[model samples]
Target: ACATLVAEIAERHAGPVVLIAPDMQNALRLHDEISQFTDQMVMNLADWETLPYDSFSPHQDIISSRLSTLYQLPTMQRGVLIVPVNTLMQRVCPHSFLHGHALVMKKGQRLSRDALRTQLDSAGYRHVDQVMEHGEYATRGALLDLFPMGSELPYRLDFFDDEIDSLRVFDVDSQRTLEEVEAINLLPAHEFPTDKAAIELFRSQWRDTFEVKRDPEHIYQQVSKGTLPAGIEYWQPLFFSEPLPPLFSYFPANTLLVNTGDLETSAERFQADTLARFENRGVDPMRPLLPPQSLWLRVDELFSELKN
Candidate 1:
């Protein structure tokens, strides 16, 4: 019945299809079964966890999945995106933010290494001694290597006198070139893409939100020195240059919307759970609370946006 419903909707609808699931497990399950019925791409958010800033980096699967979905939307002819109610509760940066930050390079394009390095820096990539992990870039003479968050393997660019001579994907273990590509689109590895202006904005917002300052002054200094602070993912909103939008806003205009099970119940449960968790760590002068709007979409507001 669920497959039939999705198939029927896809057959009749002229736009992208959104199927909301009661939970993450159901969302992934539905995505797997329904993908067999459609030629279009089927995408789902990977299992997600929000943790302290000092915690580990986001799962690579989640980053790649999100970039893949966002990249397809501009000219996406057809697709199905299965989203859990919990994902809908989280707010995301504006679509324009991603668009403006993406770095596109093609074989034979003339790009100086210095300029590319600056681009990587502004897009939240770290300059490391070795490019061993996603979001890290390293330079060796005319060779530039980077592991873009959206890619399965890191890219190696060999430049010949200001012209991109070759682009290849190589194995991190063996450090051997696997294949050559004509072009590559590099998405921001970290959620926060900041510049001088954004840093100033972050400072202003920080002062306005917290009556008492915290140890985060050291974190800000690291960013100023051109190194991202460890676990800065928790402070993503401070880097936003534009108004953040609900996840639904990223979908194209003509999208078919579907809801499974009790969406309201799922949303309410998530909200209560989040609030309860936050209460456990309440009013720490050292750690400030990000405004709810910066992190989540209220249940009432979420449904209202869906309706609109």
Candidate 2:
């Protein structure tokens, strides 16, 4: 159903369409649908580097000396790196993006900092400290040396046993490493934080509300004000519009990352649970998913065939 709808629009557009997916397989799936819209189908094998854009290089060049027309022209030479400010605040301390960060953590999941630290020292992480950097840990006198998210390598935990004997950095890939020890933190990846169900949090934080009112000089103004209940905020005002002040602000430092299965399921649930949050607080977490007006025509024709 989705493919057919996208296909019709692609044909009408008759131009290049960019699709971002977790991997090539998913990209290929979307490509098949989009191909129906045009003839110029090209897929460049590439990995988008997050920062220091020039850090990445391909062994095989896309444009070859053999091809006369297929050329590699660097268009956007400059790069810009931006992350949500709220993500920074979530961390107990600042850490490196290259190394994975730590999960803000849930109760009973995995909380013992000391035990985790002991495991890291045995694994061989360089100077595993409890704070700073995505790959360092320090957990008090008994043991230290813990790795955090944004690490370039795997997670490591040093154990003290009756007393912490030694620490080692466990390679996430091979599960072993020989690097010199250093500092490590508990910060995991930013994706671990999720506001999917945290509705009440927004209400307590952002009390100001803006409605269509007489603007003195600015284009927008704040009028009516209220609080949003839990659950509903994730559906209406959030996922549906270009909200002012931005939703990222109200969210806790914990930015939850939902996997594909969770994303799909949560998306549907968000749509279904839209009533309470919007009615109570006028907040919408699902606002991001709302399609723009311009996309409507393309999307309508695309999905028409799928209608029951």
Candidate 3:
């Protein structure tokens, strides 16, 4: 029923139609149902699949799909963009970060091996021994291998001196070349920047949020050392030095917003659970969690945000 309503709404709007789902399961179900009703592009923005204030980051595929949707949203002309209430409430990195961090490599470009390495590092690509997972890159001599975000297979770039000589998609298991490609677009490995300036911002924000000198968890120190520790995702907002913007901020002004699921109740439940967890978290001062407000929109705020 929701899908039929959304499809009708989508057909009338020239701009993209944004559907807010109550939860991940509903968001996915809506995607399937909506597709049955229309041939238009329907994208279901992925959720982290982790609990609020959970002591771990989401999987690489989840991050990749999310970043892909985000990177494409700003320029997306028309489509059904389905966003879960929980996912939409959480703040995201700025648009500038996505535009600036994206790397485009082609047949003939002045590409310095060392400079590219620095770019990948700042962009949050892990320097792995083998390029196996999304966001992992391996460098061996003149060859640069990268499993860019949203990619199914890794690409091996054979660089001739300071220029890209050839690009080929290689099999991850057999390490055999599949096909040659003229160019490849490498999205940033992570949402937030880990460069020198961003790190400085994170440090200052960290000081303001928690005790710096008597650091119980040493999160500040680990980020300073250039290694993002597990669960550092919780402090992602601090990396920006301020609150990250909402998902709605990414949409074009003319885009239509539709509540496709029970967003109000979902938002209330999510916030309540977060507050309850934070209340319980008072006992474990060792791993301090950021207040829920700093990370996401409150139930009232979510409604007001949608209203605007």
Top lDDT hit: 3
Question: Per-residue alpha-carbon lDDT of model 2 for 27-70, expressed as tens digits?
Answer: 44555554554454333223222211111221111111101111
Query: How do the candidates rank by lDDT, highest first?
Result: 3, 1, 2
Prediction 1 global C-alpha lDDT: 0.74
TM-score of every model versus the real structure: 0.86, 0.25, 0.91
- Report the lDDT tens digits of candidate 3 across residue range 227-301: 787778877888775578877789985798898657778788888988999888844545677888878888888
lDDT of each: 0.74, 0.29, 0.83
Q: In model 2, which runs have C-alpha deviations exceeding 4 angstroms?
A: 1-24, 28-141, 144-147, 157-168, 171-177, 184-203, 206-308
Q: Give per-residue lDDT, candidate 2, residue 220.
A: 22
List the candidates ranked by TM-score, beginning with the highest. Answer: 3, 1, 2
Residue 289 miss distance in model 1 (angstroms): 0.8
lDDT per residue as tens, model 1, 6-116: 866876678778888888788888987988887777777554555523335576557666776766665555777788888877777677867777889999998988788
User: Model 2 residue 259 lDDT?
Assistant: 19
Q: Candidate 3, clashing residue pairs?
A: none
